[PDB]
Structure 1
Amino acid sequence: KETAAAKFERQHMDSSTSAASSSNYCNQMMKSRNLTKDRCKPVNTFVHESLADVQAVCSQKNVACKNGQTNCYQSYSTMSITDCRETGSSKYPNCAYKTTQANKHIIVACEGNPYVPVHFDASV
Protein backbone atom coordinates (compact mmCIF):
# COMPACT_ATOMS: atom_id res chain seq x y z
CA LYS A 1 0.00 0.00 0.00
CA GLU A 2 2.88 2.30 0.99
CA THR A 3 5.54 1.92 -1.70
CA ALA A 4 9.24 1.70 -0.86
CA ALA A 5 9.61 5.18 -2.36
CA ALA A 6 6.89 6.68 -0.17
CA LYS A 7 8.30 5.00 2.96
CA PHE A 8 11.74 6.59 2.11
CA GLU A 9 10.09 10.07 2.11
CA ARG A 10 8.21 9.39 5.36
CA GLN A 11 11.27 8.02 7.21
CA HIS A 12 14.03 10.30 5.92
CA MET A 13 12.84 13.54 4.23
CA ASP A 14 12.53 16.82 6.01
CA SER A 15 12.56 19.68 3.48
CA SER A 16 10.77 22.01 5.87
CA THR A 17 13.92 23.04 7.75
CA SER A 18 17.61 23.65 6.94
CA ALA A 19 18.71 21.73 10.08
CA ALA A 20 17.21 20.34 13.31
CA SER A 21 15.65 23.13 15.39
CA SER A 22 16.06 21.78 18.94
CA SER A 23 17.33 18.85 20.99
CA ASN A 24 13.72 17.62 20.81
CA TYR A 25 13.64 17.42 16.99
CA CYS A 26 14.19 13.65 16.73
CA ASN A 27 11.64 13.01 19.54
CA GLN A 28 8.96 15.03 17.68
CA MET A 29 9.81 13.68 14.22
CA MET A 30 10.09 10.01 15.14
CA LYS A 31 6.64 10.28 16.67
CA SER A 32 4.86 12.41 14.04
CA ARG A 33 6.08 10.26 11.09
CA ASN A 34 4.85 7.19 13.00
CA LEU A 35 8.32 5.67 12.96
CA THR A 36 7.95 4.31 16.48
CA LYS A 37 4.61 2.47 16.22
CA ASP A 38 6.08 -1.02 16.00
CA ARG A 39 9.30 -0.59 17.99
CA CYS A 40 11.94 2.08 18.71
CA LYS A 41 14.24 2.23 15.65
CA PRO A 42 17.76 2.45 17.14
CA VAL A 43 18.95 5.08 14.64
CA ASN A 44 17.35 7.21 11.93
CA THR A 45 18.61 9.98 9.62
CA PHE A 46 16.52 12.92 8.33
CA VAL A 47 17.69 14.83 5.24
CA HIS A 48 17.09 18.57 5.05
CA GLU A 49 17.28 19.04 1.29
CA SER A 50 14.59 19.38 -1.39
CA LEU A 51 12.99 16.19 -2.69
CA ALA A 52 14.38 16.93 -6.16
CA ASP A 53 18.02 17.17 -4.87
CA VAL A 54 17.63 13.82 -3.05
CA GLN A 55 15.97 12.07 -6.02
CA ALA A 56 18.89 13.35 -8.18
CA VAL A 57 21.23 11.24 -6.04
CA CYS A 58 20.08 8.29 -8.20
CA SER A 59 22.09 9.79 -11.11
CA GLN A 60 25.19 10.64 -9.07
CA LYS A 61 28.15 8.61 -7.85
CA ASN A 62 27.54 4.86 -8.14
CA VAL A 63 28.97 2.92 -5.16
CA ALA A 64 28.53 -0.55 -3.62
CA CYS A 65 25.68 -0.97 -1.13
CA LYS A 66 26.42 -2.66 2.24
CA ASN A 67 24.64 -5.79 1.01
CA GLY A 68 26.95 -5.92 -2.02
CA GLN A 69 24.46 -4.83 -4.67
CA THR A 70 25.36 -2.08 -7.13
CA ASN A 71 22.27 0.17 -7.14
CA CYS A 72 23.67 2.52 -4.42
CA TYR A 73 24.64 6.14 -5.16
CA GLN A 74 26.51 8.67 -3.05
CA SER A 75 25.59 12.38 -3.26
CA TYR A 76 28.26 14.44 -5.06
CA SER A 77 27.88 17.14 -2.39
CA THR A 78 27.39 16.91 1.37
CA MET A 79 23.80 17.41 2.53
CA SER A 80 22.38 18.80 5.77
CA ILE A 81 21.26 15.76 7.81
CA THR A 82 19.97 15.11 11.35
CA ASP A 83 21.20 11.99 13.21
CA CYS A 84 18.67 10.49 15.71
CA ARG A 85 20.04 7.77 18.04
CA GLU A 86 18.16 6.16 20.94
CA THR A 87 19.27 7.43 24.37
CA GLY A 88 20.00 5.18 27.38
CA SER A 89 16.53 6.06 28.71
CA SER A 90 14.45 4.68 25.84
CA LYS A 91 12.02 1.78 26.30
CA TYR A 92 9.10 1.16 23.89
CA PRO A 93 6.59 2.61 23.68
CA ASN A 94 8.46 5.53 25.30
CA CYS A 95 11.22 5.79 22.68
CA ALA A 96 13.72 8.62 23.23
CA TYR A 97 16.29 10.18 20.91
CA LYS A 98 19.45 12.28 20.93
CA THR A 99 19.36 14.85 18.06
CA THR A 100 22.66 15.65 16.31
CA GLN A 101 23.20 18.08 13.39
CA ALA A 102 25.54 16.93 10.60
CA ASN A 103 26.62 17.63 7.01
CA LYS A 104 27.69 14.47 5.16
CA HIS A 105 27.39 12.69 1.80
CA ILE A 106 24.34 10.33 1.74
CA ILE A 107 24.33 6.88 0.09
CA VAL A 108 20.90 5.59 -0.98
CA ALA A 109 19.81 2.52 -2.97
CA CYS A 110 17.59 3.36 -5.97
CA GLU A 111 15.00 1.34 -7.78
CA GLY A 112 12.16 1.48 -10.25
CA ASN A 113 11.02 3.60 -13.18
CA PRO A 114 11.06 6.42 -12.20
CA TYR A 115 14.39 5.54 -10.58
CA VAL A 116 14.12 6.83 -7.01
CA PRO A 117 15.57 6.36 -3.55
CA VAL A 118 14.10 3.42 -1.61
CA HIS A 119 16.57 2.85 1.20
CA PHE A 120 19.07 4.98 3.11
CA ASP A 121 22.30 2.89 3.16
CA ALA A 122 24.77 5.13 5.01
CA SER A 123 26.09 8.68 5.50
CA VAL A 124 29.78 9.45 4.78
Structure 2
Amino acid sequence: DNSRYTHFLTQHYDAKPQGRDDRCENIMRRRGLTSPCKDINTFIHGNKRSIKAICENKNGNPHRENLRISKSSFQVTTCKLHGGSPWPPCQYRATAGFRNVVVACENGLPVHLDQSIFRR
Protein backbone atom coordinates (compact mmCIF):
# COMPACT_ATOMS: atom_id res chain seq x y z
CA ASP A 1 0.00 0.00 0.00
CA ASN A 2 1.48 3.30 -1.23
CA SER A 3 -1.14 4.92 0.98
CA ARG A 4 1.62 6.11 3.29
CA TYR A 5 3.37 7.93 0.43
CA THR A 6 0.00 9.22 -0.62
CA HIS A 7 -0.74 10.53 2.87
CA PHE A 8 2.69 12.09 2.70
CA LEU A 9 2.00 14.15 -0.45
CA THR A 10 -1.32 15.14 1.15
CA GLN A 11 0.32 16.40 4.30
CA HIS A 12 3.58 17.76 3.00
CA TYR A 13 3.55 18.50 -0.68
CA ASP A 14 2.03 21.65 -2.15
CA ALA A 15 3.68 22.11 -5.54
CA LYS A 16 3.02 25.86 -5.67
CA PRO A 17 1.96 27.96 -2.65
CA GLN A 18 -0.38 30.65 -4.01
CA GLY A 19 0.87 32.93 -1.33
CA ARG A 20 2.26 31.73 1.95
CA ASP A 21 0.66 33.76 4.68
CA ASP A 22 -1.48 32.81 7.69
CA ARG A 23 -4.51 32.60 5.38
CA CYS A 24 -2.16 27.92 6.24
CA GLU A 25 -5.69 27.98 7.58
CA ASN A 26 -6.89 26.99 4.14
CA ILE A 27 -4.55 24.24 3.03
CA MET A 28 -4.83 22.68 6.46
CA ARG A 29 -8.62 22.47 5.96
CA ARG A 30 -8.35 21.48 2.27
CA ARG A 31 -5.99 18.69 3.38
CA GLY A 32 -8.05 17.45 6.31
CA LEU A 33 -5.79 18.43 9.19
CA THR A 34 -8.30 20.15 11.43
CA SER A 35 -10.19 17.53 13.44
CA PRO A 36 -8.49 17.73 15.77
CA CYS A 37 -6.33 20.72 14.84
CA LYS A 38 -2.93 19.45 13.80
CA ASP A 39 -0.44 21.31 15.96
CA ILE A 40 2.34 21.82 13.44
CA ASN A 41 2.65 20.88 9.79
CA THR A 42 5.01 21.72 7.01
CA PHE A 43 4.48 21.84 3.27
CA ILE A 44 7.26 21.35 0.79
CA HIS A 45 6.95 23.27 -2.49
CA GLY A 46 8.68 22.94 -5.86
CA ASN A 47 8.71 19.95 -8.20
CA LYS A 48 8.05 16.40 -6.95
CA ARG A 49 10.88 14.63 -8.77
CA SER A 50 13.24 16.64 -6.60
CA ILE A 51 11.59 15.82 -3.28
CA LYS A 52 11.35 12.19 -4.43
CA ALA A 53 15.11 12.12 -5.13
CA ILE A 54 15.88 12.53 -1.42
CA CYS A 55 15.41 8.75 -1.56
CA GLU A 56 18.90 8.02 -2.91
CA ASN A 57 22.35 9.58 -2.80
CA LYS A 58 21.28 11.92 -5.62
CA ASN A 59 19.74 14.22 -3.02
CA GLY A 60 19.95 12.34 0.24
CA ASN A 61 22.15 11.37 3.12
CA PRO A 62 21.35 8.93 5.95
CA HIS A 63 20.49 10.72 9.15
CA ARG A 64 19.73 10.18 12.84
CA GLU A 65 17.85 6.91 13.12
CA ASN A 66 17.11 5.72 9.57
CA LEU A 67 15.85 9.05 8.30
CA ARG A 68 17.31 10.72 5.20
CA ILE A 69 18.26 14.33 4.91
CA SER A 70 18.09 16.23 1.65
CA LYS A 71 21.24 17.64 0.11
CA SER A 72 19.37 20.54 -1.43
CA SER A 73 17.10 23.14 0.15
CA PHE A 74 13.40 23.50 -0.56
CA GLN A 75 10.97 26.35 -0.28
CA VAL A 76 8.84 25.27 2.60
CA THR A 77 6.01 26.56 4.76
CA THR A 78 5.26 25.74 8.33
CA CYS A 79 1.79 26.06 9.78
CA LYS A 80 1.68 26.33 13.57
CA LEU A 81 -1.57 26.10 15.46
CA HIS A 82 -2.14 29.21 17.50
CA GLY A 83 -4.41 29.43 20.52
CA GLY A 84 -3.50 26.08 22.06
CA SER A 85 -7.08 24.72 21.64
CA PRO A 86 -7.33 21.46 19.64
CA TRP A 87 -10.69 22.16 18.00
CA PRO A 88 -11.80 24.15 14.96
CA PRO A 89 -11.84 26.83 14.09
CA CYS A 90 -8.12 26.09 13.58
CA GLN A 91 -6.06 29.28 13.45
CA TYR A 92 -2.52 29.02 12.07
CA ARG A 93 0.59 31.19 11.89
CA ALA A 94 2.52 30.70 8.64
CA THR A 95 6.29 30.64 8.41
CA ALA A 96 7.91 30.46 5.01
CA GLY A 97 11.30 28.82 5.08
CA PHE A 98 14.13 27.69 2.90
CA ARG A 99 16.30 24.78 3.96
CA ASN A 100 16.95 21.07 3.54
CA VAL A 101 14.55 18.50 4.92
CA VAL A 102 14.49 15.31 6.96
CA VAL A 103 12.33 12.40 5.82
CA ALA A 104 11.76 8.65 5.94
CA CYS A 105 12.01 6.59 2.75
CA GLU A 106 10.43 3.17 2.47
CA ASN A 107 11.02 1.21 -0.71
CA GLY A 108 12.27 4.50 -2.14
CA LEU A 109 9.14 6.55 -1.43
CA PRO A 110 8.66 9.28 1.13
CA VAL A 111 6.35 8.17 3.94
CA HIS A 112 7.27 10.60 6.67
CA LEU A 113 8.44 14.11 7.35
CA ASP A 114 10.36 14.79 10.53
CA GLN A 115 8.53 17.83 11.92
CA SER A 116 10.96 18.47 14.75
CA ILE A 117 13.32 20.55 12.60
CA PHE A 118 10.59 23.19 12.02
CA ARG A 119 9.27 23.24 15.57
CA ARG A 120 12.08 25.64 16.47
Common fold by TM > 0.5: yes
* AA of the residue aligned to 2:106: E
**Alignment partner of 1:106 out of 101, 111, 117:** 101
Partner residue of 2:29? 31
Is the contact made by 2:21 and 2:95 (CA closer than 8 Å) also made in structure 1? no
Partner residue of 1:12? 12
- CA displacement, residues 51-78 of structure 1 (integer Å, 9 cap, x when unaligned): 11111011111112xxx3x2x1111111
CA–CA distance in structure 1, aligned partners of residues 55 and 76 of structure 2: 18
- TM-score with structure 2 length normalisation? 0.85
Shift of 1:96: 1.0
Which segments of 5 or more consecutive residues in structure 2 lack a partner in the other structure? Answer: none
Partner residue of 1:121? 114
Is the contact made by 1:20 and 1:101 (CA closer than 8 Å) also made in structure 2? no
CA–CA distance in structure 1, aligned partners of residues 101 and 70 of structure 2: 6
CA–CA distance in structure 1, aligned partners of residues 29 and 2 of structure 2: 18
**Alignment partner of 1:96 out of 86, 91, 96:** 91
Partner residue of 1:45? 42
RMSD, aligned α-carbons = 2.0
CA–CA distance in structure 1, aligned partners of residues 2 and 105 of structure 2: 16
Q: Tell whether 2:52 aligns with 1:55.
A: yes
Is the contact made by 1:85 and 1:98 (CA closer than 8 Å) also made in structure 2? yes
Shift of 1:104: 1.3
Which segments of structure 1 move beyond 2 Å, counting only runs of 4 or more?
A: 19-23
Q: Percent identity?
A: 31
